[PDB]
From Swiss-Prot:
<comment type="function">
    <text>Photoactive blue light protein. Probably functions as a photoreceptor for a negative phototaxis response.</text>
</comment>
<keyword id="KW-0157">Chromophore</keyword>
<feature type="modified residue" description="S-(4-hydroxycinnamyl)cysteine">
    <location>
        <position position="69"/>
    </location>
</feature>
<dbReference type="InterPro" id="IPR000014">
    <property type="entry name" value="PAS"/>
</dbReference>
<feature type="domain" description="PAS">
    <location>
        <begin position="23"/>
        <end position="86"/>
    </location>
</feature>
<dbReference type="Pfam" id="PF00989">
    <property type="entry name" value="PAS"/>
</dbReference>
<comment type="subunit">
    <text>Monomer.</text>
</comment>
<dbReference type="InterPro" id="IPR012130">
    <property type="entry name" value="PYP"/>
</dbReference>
<protein>
    <recommendedName>
        <fullName>Photoactive yellow protein</fullName>
    </recommendedName>
</protein>
<dbReference type="InterPro" id="IPR035965">
    <property type="entry name" value="PAS-like_dom_sf"/>
</dbReference>
<dbReference type="InterPro" id="IPR013767">
    <property type="entry name" value="PAS_fold"/>
</dbReference>
<dbReference type="GO" id="GO:0042802">
    <property type="term" value="F:identical protein binding"/>
</dbReference>
<keyword id="KW-0600">Photoreceptor protein</keyword>
<keyword id="KW-0675">Receptor</keyword>
<dbReference type="GO" id="GO:0006355">
    <property type="term" value="P:regulation of DNA-templated transcription"/>
</dbReference>
<dbReference type="GO" id="GO:0007602">
    <property type="term" value="P:phototransduction"/>
</dbReference>
<keyword id="KW-0716">Sensory transduction</keyword>
Amino acid sequence: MEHVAFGSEDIENTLAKMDDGQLDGLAFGAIQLDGDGNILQYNAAEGDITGRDPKQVIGKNFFKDVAPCTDSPEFYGKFKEGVASGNLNTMFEYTFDYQMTPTKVKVHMKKALSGDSYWVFVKRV
């Protein structure tokens, strides 16, 4: 298993070297998004938390298609204030309830090193 702590400050660096293989190795959910919110990567652990199948969720819109319950000011709005600003780094608690048992999680979103793309890291709470 891969040694990185959630909320780690330099985390967007650490993961800069991970492939889809090394990503499934973490202790917590990891989604890589573009600016439109289409999903570029999606780890085993977020599959574990949400019951979604990592491999099929790739290419879908996170906020249109995969998780409509994050299409609020308090999540999607955040995300998109970040994308136009060019910078994003926020952590917050949040309840995933879409087509699933309501699950309280903590969320950290953050801009990745790579061009136009963003992470969301998720862990139970």
